[PDB]
């Protein structure tokens, strides 16, 4: 199925295409495999498109929300998370 | 009772015929020579302008249609309860040469305020200009942006007789004058305050609309602006702002482009910031003397200023042989409204000793103060402490004399100003031929 | 399924889009993020480059000054030793555990503190900062502003501010240029306080192509402040020059100046360990790149708190929002922009 | 290595300053002209009242740029690779310094100008929100004035710089301004007449190339026409309104932004910068009456009927130049070598063959020869610029070179503020009565 989707894409942070957005409205596993197939066949534009969609699912969300949504265990101590939060605030506009 | 446009339409044909006869009978009369040093010195002393509104009397000061400052203070109509002349009344005098009645001035004020609503695109651009764009630049930008409303430009494009130019020029000028207080106060609120403005009072006069929109309801401030806007309205046609507006207007540019160009000349540091330069000098003096305004202390400072080679700003003119009546009119306003104001006490103490000190030094032709030596302190009293905005106020006033002359020039069909230029090399060749044919 | 079963190369691309979110997820992404900026730093300034040799201790002292805020995050990487001649760069404490902060410290000019602040024309200050050679060609994404810090005793002495001239240029190279705000900026100052005034942005000082193929990454930026007030306002400490920074405060809300309370000490604005790093870095660059003598003596430059700023915004429709200002993170902390 | 424009001018201007000082010291009292009463009432026609170094009109050979005719600069000035047209940047070097730049100096000056071409955010925002019915010349002056926030001269003056350093900041402001003019003019063209979408500036393309490309054309022949247009319109003495206005405003130490904006407002005058549009409208009226019949008898028929009806043949007839304007012949050769079969040029060419003879037999025209404005519209019409209301903007983009060159020269030599004397008609009568009686 992934090979079929890749050929569809060939037939049809730079901005993402809306046709590619509908093309990547599939489930998370299929989205993972599409990125894998583009990386394997050196289809870099399709690779970047799949990454940007994943990035939008992550962007602006808290660490806890990302861990639940993407199934990741927290191995940080509470003080380590606070120090990282301050570092990330240094990267913000203020 | 006749309006301003009706009365002017009856006066300008007389002036037009008088000029036509004068040039026909005396046109070949020589009035001056052009020396090489003059064309290389800014045309100083060359009579190259016909400005009907005002002439400088060497002993009585500026004369508006022959009337001195004392004359216009006595004869011009005033607002109800005020002893100060109205700038609208002086505009009537500048354009017609006659003193209007009380009802005629009030109807002219109502006509101006009825033309005071700014178009949406002008309010939009003013609200989007950055605060570090100088107020004078925002002033001429807003005036230029009104060109889309020019009745003269539209009439000229459609095709109108030359004898009808003045009519559309008159309407453009009054449409423009009515919006100048709104534009000026919009810039003041946007740059220096919170950008919030009041609404135009349809029954308020020109200066009162400016003060209220700036954000003050003090009637003494309103009276100050009435005096300020009146006495700065016009001062001959040789100055850069007046000459520029006449020059641009002679090419049949609308009053919007003529005033905007005149304002850009007024923005020049050598032209429109004399009262700010006085204010800086007063503040530096006030710091050195630590607010000791005694006769001995001030005289010592003035002598040190002159002996070091520097001048006393506001004092010293090349023509007027007495004190500027505009200065005395501002001194009187301060005496009657805030005689204890510390900054006025400093200005007054300078007035009492500077002519005597400058005389003993003996290097100043006429050691007397002009209008700029006193205007700054009066503005400082009511909260207008931003010196960069003072040239905008000067423009709101000077636009009266500028537009009066522009309407007159279009009525008499004044010609385009087109002198001749040469390079320095061609001036050398020209001088050699003149001197060889002695 | 999980995000962790994706290849490492895909994770690195995800880190190019959402680095700050991912680096807070688990130790894996934090360490991979630190490694990513190790590669960025060393591909820019190789391990054998002279810059690492001359800035090592001063750079470590700057990063160490951040420990009260980030020590628990820095100590996630444990196999580090104190900086020394025999300790490799990839094992140096305050560097190998801080590539993200080290890289940003080298990519932007640090602050310049006026060390003579508490002592016709008269020189108020003359100092240095390190400047990336390509600051101009990257101005769209990363403009380099020039901000000046003054103590102003009252609104009336503020009128002398446009008469303090800021002169900038490459140390012993090229012509000097003057950066300045509008001449009437003082008229927007209405009370005593400490003021940060934006003098615009750093102008084009040279053609960058003359540095193509020369291996130069940083230049010494010389700054000179001149008192041309023709008064005693600076001699009487009614107008005190505190220093300069190049921080783009509040990019989303363009401003002309902002005020903080004058009771604050100079350490509330300037990190001495950062200024010492930038100063000695620039000095070492001047000694390595030019034979001519530096025209001024080598100076010795030696707890972030919430300080509310009241801005005078550049756009007239921008209104005040005090609640937002209270909630924002501190502005006297490092600005990580890349 | 190769000196830059600023470095070379820094070596040249002190020599010109010493030359002017000794010339005025030795021959300053030499009278060079009279001022008759008819002249002060006739726009100072024939009065030498301007020192303009860039260009002088030769009554026999046409306009001369630093002594070079149109044919001279077409031979002497550097050109772009593959082109035979002079570059306007090269003429700007000639106007300012008086010398011919090298091919690498021109390419470096073009790169410096394009490096300064980025419009500030507030200027882009301002232009995009201006209404389409606001005339492009008004939008042009507005955009130029809005750049005053960038003026290095205004900031340096507020810092109290020495008078001897004025020219340096005037120079930098002029180059910053020149670099942004193509972007401003093209942005106005895209917003008013197209879809408002504009490209980016090529840092290696020249002045006219970036203008054409940003307008929306990649045709290199169009680029060659713009190189010729912007060159030949760059300067024409200092007596014309636009040049005189910018000098007048600049003499009050206003920045190049305010000086050029005032000069542009004068160029927007219907009696100054609309001759191109006038010729084109008269040509389209002719084309519709004859229906593509450009026979000599049919054209001569139309010319005699027009002259008998009192109307004039626009573009033909000059008061000084005794032959055909070389700027006209340069544009005529361009059309012959690029589109000799263009229908509108065939009409222009047939009028050039017939109109001088028709006007000579009518006898009411001194020099019945065409000028530059009789040939510029057809060339622009060929490449898609058919919106005539934009033509004066192109004139301003070109004339700014000569305006800013003289302004830089004025500041380097410390030219004084232009302040002539004015009088009212009443006082002029008294002045004449005293002269004639004596």
XYZ file of C-alpha atoms in Angstrom, chain D residues 2 17 50 110 115 138-139 156 167 328 369 373 380 404-405:
15
model
C 39.639 51.550 -8.400
C 35.101 75.089 -3.854
C 20.740 79.443 -10.322
C 25.220 49.622 -9.636
C 22.394 46.781 -2.096
C 1.408 61.556 -5.378
C 2.205 58.004 -4.265
C 23.630 63.799 11.926
C 28.075 66.474 2.026
C 14.576 63.081 -29.979
C 11.603 71.153 -34.331
C 8.644 64.444 -25.389
C 6.978 53.026 -24.008
C 20.657 64.626 -6.210
C 23.975 65.266 -7.975
